[PDB]
Amino acid sequence: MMYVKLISSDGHEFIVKREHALTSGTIKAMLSNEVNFREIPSHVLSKVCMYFTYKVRYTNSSTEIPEFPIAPEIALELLMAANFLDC
Template sequence: MVSNSNNGMSKYVTLRSSDGFEFVVLREAACRSGAIRRMLDPKSAFREAAASVCTFEEINGIILDKVAEYFYYNHKNRNQEDVPDMDIPPELCLELLMAADFLDSLFTVCSSLHC
């Protein structure tokens, strides 16, 4: 809710972790996740869509930090030919795996949607 764009949707969305950390990320970047995309779909009746805040009860702050980092990594490299690797500390790998499953994060971009 940093700014409001023309169609009444903010350019940024807030991701809130289970332990209360909030990450404000570009809507376009966050919408790479299928789950977030559905949550924020203005056509849906989800509370998150109206408030542009997604709360994840399953994901803690450390992991959500990495997830937000990934969104930007994905967003930044979406048209790159040579994509650099993203470093993940090994101790986070399992939790990130669970988060990945939850978010159904794809590398394909939802360009057709309102992102």
């Protein structure tokens, strides 16, 4: 189980499973290890990782799916992040 280093505009290291982290359409292009951002802070990046975790685990599975929670202020910050990282 491989893992990649995602780094933000505050040096915040994010080790997330390479398969979970490949769910991004934009990150996928730069793979087929050390990815860096600047428009993206840390509080958004952890939430994007939390979406990555979630997606794989509840995608395709016929079991009932929980509610994804977005903090009001992080919502726009994440709206352009989901735009960029292409969900």
